[PDB]
Amino acid sequence: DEKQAQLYDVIIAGGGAGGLSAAVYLARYNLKVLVIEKGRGRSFWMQDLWNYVPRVVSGKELIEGGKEMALHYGADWLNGFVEAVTDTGEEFQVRVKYRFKNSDYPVFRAKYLIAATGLMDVLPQLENMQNVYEYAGYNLHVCLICDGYEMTNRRAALIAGSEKAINTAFVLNWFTPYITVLTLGAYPVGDEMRAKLADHGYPLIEKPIARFLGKDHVMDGIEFADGTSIKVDTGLISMGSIRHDGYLKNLDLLTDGGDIVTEYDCRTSHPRVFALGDLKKGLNQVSIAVADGTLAATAIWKEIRRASAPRKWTAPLQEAAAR
Amino acid sequence: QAQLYDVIIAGGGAGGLSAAVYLARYNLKVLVIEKGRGRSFWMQDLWNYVPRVVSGKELIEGGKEMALHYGADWLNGFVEAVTDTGEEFQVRVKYRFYPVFRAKYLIAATGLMDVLPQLENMQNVYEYAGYNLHVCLICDGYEMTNRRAALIAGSEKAINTAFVLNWFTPYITVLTLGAYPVGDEMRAKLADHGYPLIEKPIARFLGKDHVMDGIEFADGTSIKVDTGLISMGSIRHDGYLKNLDLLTDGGDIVTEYDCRTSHPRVFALGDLKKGLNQVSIAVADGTLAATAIWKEIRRA
Ligand SMILES: Cc1cc2nc3c(=O)[nH]c(=O)nc-3n(C[C@H](O)[C@H](O)[C@H](O)COP(=O)(O)OP(=O)(O)OC[C@H]3O[C@@H](n4cnc5c(N)ncnc54)[C@H](O)[C@@H]3O)c2cc1C
Ligand SMILES: Cc1cc2nc3c(=O)[nH]c(=O)nc-3n(C[C@H](O)[C@H](O)[C@H](O)COP(=O)(O)OP(=O)(O)OC[C@H]3O[C@@H](n4cnc5c(N)ncnc54)[C@H](O)[C@@H]3O)c2cc1C
Ligand SMILES: Cc1cc2nc3c(=O)[nH]c(=O)nc-3n(C[C@H](O)[C@H](O)[C@H](O)COP(=O)(O)OP(=O)(O)OC[C@H]3O[C@@H](n4cnc5c(N)ncnc54)[C@H](O)[C@@H]3O)c2cc1C
Ligand SMILES: Cc1cc2nc3c(=O)[nH]c(=O)nc-3n(C[C@H](O)[C@H](O)[C@H](O)COP(=O)(O)OP(=O)(O)OC[C@H]3O[C@@H](n4cnc5c(N)ncnc54)[C@H](O)[C@@H]3O)c2cc1C
Numbered sequence: 001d002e003k004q005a006q007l008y009d010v011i012i013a014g015g016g017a018g019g020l021s022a023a024v025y026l027a028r029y030n031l032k033v034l035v036i037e038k039g040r041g042r043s044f045w046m047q048d049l050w051n052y053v054p055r056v057v058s059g060k061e062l063i064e065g066g067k068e069m070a071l072h073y074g075a076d077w078l079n080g081f082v083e084a085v086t087d088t089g090e091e092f093q094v095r096v097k098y099r100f101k102n103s104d105y106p107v108f109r110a111k112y113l114i115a116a117t118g119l120m121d122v123l124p125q126l127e128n129m130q131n132v133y134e135y136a137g138y139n140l141h142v143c144l145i146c147d148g149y150e151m152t153n154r155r156a157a158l159i160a161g162s163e164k165a166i167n168t169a170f171v172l173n174w175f176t177p178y179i180t181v182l183t184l185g186a187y188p189v190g191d192e193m194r195a196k197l198a199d200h201g202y203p204l205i206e207k208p209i210a211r212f213l214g215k216d217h218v219m220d221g222i223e224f225a226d227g228t229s230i231k232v233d234t235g236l237i238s239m240g241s242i243r244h245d246g247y248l249k250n251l252d253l254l255t256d257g258g259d260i261v262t263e264y265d266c267r268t269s270h271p272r273v274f275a276l277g278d279l280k281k282g283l284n285q286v287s288i289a290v291a292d293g294t295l296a297a298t299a300i301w302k303e304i305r306r307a308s309a310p311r312k313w314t315a316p317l318q319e320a321a322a323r
Numbered sequence: 324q325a326q327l328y329d330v331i332i333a334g335g336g337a338g339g340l341s342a343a344v345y346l347a348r349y350n351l352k353v354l355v356i357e358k359g360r361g362r363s364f365w366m367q368d369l370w371n372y373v374p375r376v377v378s379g380k381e382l383i384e385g386g387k388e389m390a391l392h393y394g395a396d397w398l399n400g401f402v403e404a405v406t407d408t409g410e411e412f413q414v415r416v417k418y419r420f421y422p423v424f425r426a427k428y429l430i431a432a433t434g435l436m437d438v439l440p441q442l443e444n445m446q447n448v449y450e451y452a453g454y455n456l457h458v459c460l461i462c463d464g465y466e467m468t469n470r471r472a473a474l475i476a477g478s479e480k481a482i483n484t485a486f487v488l489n490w491f492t493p494y495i496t497v498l499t500l501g502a503y504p505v506g507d508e509m510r511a512k513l514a515d516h517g518y519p520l521i522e523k524p525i526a527r528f529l530g531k532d533h534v535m536d537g538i539e540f541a542d543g544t545s546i547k548v549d550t551g552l553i554s555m556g557s558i559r560h561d562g563y564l565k566n567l568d569l570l571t572d573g574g575d576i577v578t579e580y581d582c583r584t585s586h587p588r589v590f591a592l593g594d595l596k597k598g599l600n601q602v603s604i605a606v607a608d609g610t611l612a613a614t615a616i617w618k619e620i621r622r623a
Contacts, residue, residue: 020373021603028371028465030491051344053337053606054377054385065374073465145614149348149393174621175350264580283614287341290373291607298461298599310486311493313517 003076008034008110010300011094013082013247016043017286018277019116020066021293027073029301034108035070036096038081042118042278043286047137050146052286062286078108082247085113087270094247111272112300115248115260116293118278122239124159124184124209135212135219140235144168145285147236148175154233157182157222159209161239163189168238169202177201180230182222184208205230243279256281265299266292274299328352328426330616331414333402333563336363337602338592339432340386341609347393349617354396354424355387356416362434362594363602365453370462372602382602398424402563405429407586414563427588428616431564431576432609434594438555440475440500440525451528451535456551459600460484463552464491470549473498473538477555479505484554485518493517496546498538500525521546561595572597581615582608590615 010026012019015037026033046059057065071077080096083105092113098104121142123132132140141147155178160166166189169179179202183189189204197204205224213221213229223229243258254261254269259281266274274296277289330346332339335357346353366379377385391397400416414424437458439448448456457463471494476482482505485495495518499505505520513520521540529537529545539545559574570577570585575597582590590612593605 017373024371024373030465030468051348051389051610053341053344053389054382055375056389057374062374069373069376149350152350171621283610285607285610287603287607287610291601291603294371294599294601294603305487305490308490310516311489312515313493313495316517316519 003034003078004106004108006032006109007091008032008076008108009304010034010112010114011036011092011108011110012114012116013085013094014041014116014118014276014279015063015067015070015077016041016116016118016277016289017062017066018118018279018289018293019114020063020070021290022114022116022274022276022297023070023075023293024066024073025294025297026300027070027075029297030074031301031304032076034076034078034110035067036078036080036082036094036108039079042120045137046146049286050149052290080106082117084247084250086250087273092272111304113251113273114276114293114296115245115268115273115279116276116289117243117245117247118289119241119243119284121237121241122161123237124239126209126211131212134217135214135235136237138217138219139233140212140219140237142237143284144172144175144236144238145283148172151175151234151236154178155231156180157230157232157235159184159235159237159239161186163187163193165238165240166193166197168236169197169200172236173200173202176234180205180232182207182209185225241278245279248273264295266296267299324422324424326352326425327411328354328396328424329620330354330428330430331356331412331424331426332430332432333414334361334431334433334592334595335383335387335397336361336432336434336593336605337382337386338434338594338605338609339430340383340390341606342430342432342590342592342613343390343395343609344386344393345610345613346616347390347395349613350394351617351620352396353394354398354426355390356398356400356402356414356424357387358401359399362436366462367453369602370465402433404563404566406566412589427620429589430582430592430612431561431584431589431595432592432605433559433561433563434605435557435559435600437553437557438477439553440555442525442527444527447527450533451530451551452553454533454535455549456528456535456553458553460488460491460552460554461599461601463550464488467491467550467552470494471547472496473546473548473551475500475551475553475555477502479503479509481554481556482509482513484552485513485516488552489516492550496521496548498522498525559595580611582612583615588619 009031010033015035043059084095207224211223251270260275276292278284329351335355363379404415406413523540576591592608594600
């Protein structure tokens with residue numbers, strides 16, 4: 001209730017890897033920052049962050065730990081869903097959906113905006129999605145950079161959401177030649193791509209998936225709608241991404257293929273709004289998002305600091321004055 | 324040694340270790356050469372790298388174990404020289420306090436070392452340096468907030484750091500150690516802001532159990548301080564890159580976004596490249612360089 005009338009220096013939409021880094025930096029610059037996080041984001045479904053020094057942690061540990069740091073240094077935190085943003089010319093107003101049912105819709109104010117809401121991987125749609133979630137993020141992966149190492153020389157299914165996504169096989173084959181391409185029967189494959197799959201020895205299965213097969217979160221097969229199946233040691237879902245960043249529509253941000261175009265310090269085309277991580281154009285890795293938070297937080301602090309009056313040691317000046 | 328590595332990494336701190344984990348997880352053959360006791364080793368608390376505050380010692384030890392676990396090679400040595408034959412890099416290494424290794428790509432990840440004030444007994448400096456006597460303002464300004472702070476400036480130009488430190492604390496004393504004259508304009512500006520200027524040589528840092536609480540000068544007088552910031556510049560010892568005619572700006576190596584330098588197939592990470600000196604930046608640099616390299620190799 002005070003949070004609402006308080007003018008923040010910065011509001012961060014999204015409290016994942018990029019937003020939490022930005023929040024710790026801004027708090028340690030002694031700036032007023034509010035983080036708004038809806039919960040259950042992409043990094044949360046990451047079982048193992050394999051490649052972020054110095055320690056392998058779960059995505060849950062990453063988020064809880066970053067949140068604890070941000071709060072310890074003075075950031076404010078709001079469990080809510082960002083709905084809309086307006087730049088009044090003087091400030092950003094951010095409308096937030098609060099509570100899941102019978103919701104309030106508070107509006108917070110800040111001088112700067114950081115968009116750190118990331119993306120969500122499209123998944124195959126089975127009647128019982130728990131069958132997918134049983135394996136997704138374990139040995140059924142969504143990111144090749146993230147898990148190609150674990151796929152090395154293993155029997156791999158590539159689930160492609162479009163004909164263009166089949167091209168992922170010709171990068172996956174860096175790690176494993178034992179690739180089967182699954183379309184789920186969702187789209188036609190032209191003969192040209194057929195010939196290329198045939199040249200490389202990658203079978204093409206166009207049947208809908210009935211079920212992922214396995215035990216204790218280890219997939220070992222896939223059953224199709226006709227009751228035939230294949231044995232696999234691993235898989236990669238390449239079906240695109242959803243961003244649900246409509247809250248940015250009033251800002252007329254320059255985009256490229258869904259990603260927000262930024263400068264090196266993550267500045268967007270709209271003054272005083274920054275874009276971090278999986279939402280900006282670039283590699284989608286935790287390391288990248290965390291570093292984006294560093295650059296944005298530092299850019300904002302430099303702007304505010306260079307516009308501020310110098311803090312003088314007034315005691316010596318006043319005492320000499322009085323004498 | 325007889326194996327042609329895909330890449331040799333000079334320096335096994337934050338950025339070099341990040342690159343090594345990525346490269347090994349690209350199933351590339353990679354060698355890290357690390358001399359030990361670098362800048363990050365002396366960091367007592369990494370405050371601002373989510374999700375966990377760790378010592379610099381823990382950062383390096385953990386990163387090294389990860390790189391080895393995914394298949395990187397590691398050598399405790401000092402990189403001396405590099406030759407680009409046109410086909411490969413030859414990297415000569417001083418081992419024990421002089422083998423030559425070969426690779427297709429070079430990552431320069433050797434960072435820098437903060438200049439420290441030179442007292443007769445440096446152990447007195449090391450007692451406090453990296454604790455509440457800081458070397459990086461972005462890293463530790465938060466902890467200095469509104470505390471009595473000494474700024475040890477290695478040159479007149481470094482005195483300008485006071486006018487950024489003052490964001491965190493206005494209670495600034497500026498120490499020159501008597502190493503240079505200070506011009507009237509800078510004198511006026513310090514006095515206008517109320518920041519004492521002390522031009523005496525330092526005898527000793529004062530404190531207990533790694534907590535500095537004062538500074539004693541050569542004439543036997545002292546000041547009380549709760550914290551301090553050293554701003555005396557940096558040393559790189561990057562002569563091993565001398566033959567590659569890399570483009571530089573003030574000692575920092577200039578790179579593209581993906582850390583490519585002016586010389587093909589050599590990258591530069593972290594504190595050694597032009598940019599912010601933070602762990603987060605170095606680690607992401609490692610990600611970008613390793614991925615650019617994998618992409619070149621994969622397309623070849
Ligand atoms: C590898 C991977 C593994 C996954 N595993 C699982 C799993 O195991 N179990 C599971 O459930 N999902 C899992 N998912 C997530 C799944 O794909 C969907 O993204 C997810 O189920 C969306 O849930 P949702 O309906 O709440 O959508 P959301 O986008 O989260 O929510 C939809 C609506 O709910 C409201 N809302 C959301 N949050 C708030 C909030 N804090 N406050 C107020 N209102 C809010 C809003 O109106 C919003 O538009 C996984 C995803 C991936 C990539
Ligand atoms: C299974 C899996 C394994 C992975 N493994 C690795 C790995 O090993 N190494 C690596 O680098 N990367 C890995 N990744 C990718 C990694 O998670 C992302 O690259 C990273 O999380 C990017 O951070 P972000 O901040 O940009 O996005 P996120 O971390 O996802 O955070 C964005 C935040 O925005 C929140 N949010 C979204 N919309 C709203 C809204 N309207 N209102 C409020 N909040 C909102 C979300 O809930 C989320 O918390 C993995 C990803 C997955 C699914
Ligand atoms: C905040 C901070 C705190 C610090 N605290 C301490 C402290 O507590 N104790 C301390 O000693 N220093 C401390 N230092 C470091 C100090 O300032 C010097 O930089 C450091 O001590 C130099 O050690 P060195 O003589 O090995 O020089 P180095 O540069 O490390 O080595 C000099 C020479 O030794 C050879 N050599 C070095 N390493 C190898 C190797 N693995 N194999 C073969 N040959 C090698 C080479 O010919 C090289 O040129 C601290 C520094 C900072 C910034
Ligand atoms: C006291 C202190 C506290 C700090 N706190 C923070 C913080 O809180 N947050 C933050 O972001 N940053 C902090 N920093 C800065 C941080 O340490 C650097 O930004 C970071 O380490 C940069 O990584 P790097 O890989 O480039 O360099 P480094 O970590 O320094 O690694 C370079 C490596 O190269 C080795 N090496 C150098 N030369 C050679 C050679 N010829 N041959 C072989 N090996 C060589 C070195 O021994 C070293 O290990 C702190 C720094 C200090 C001194």
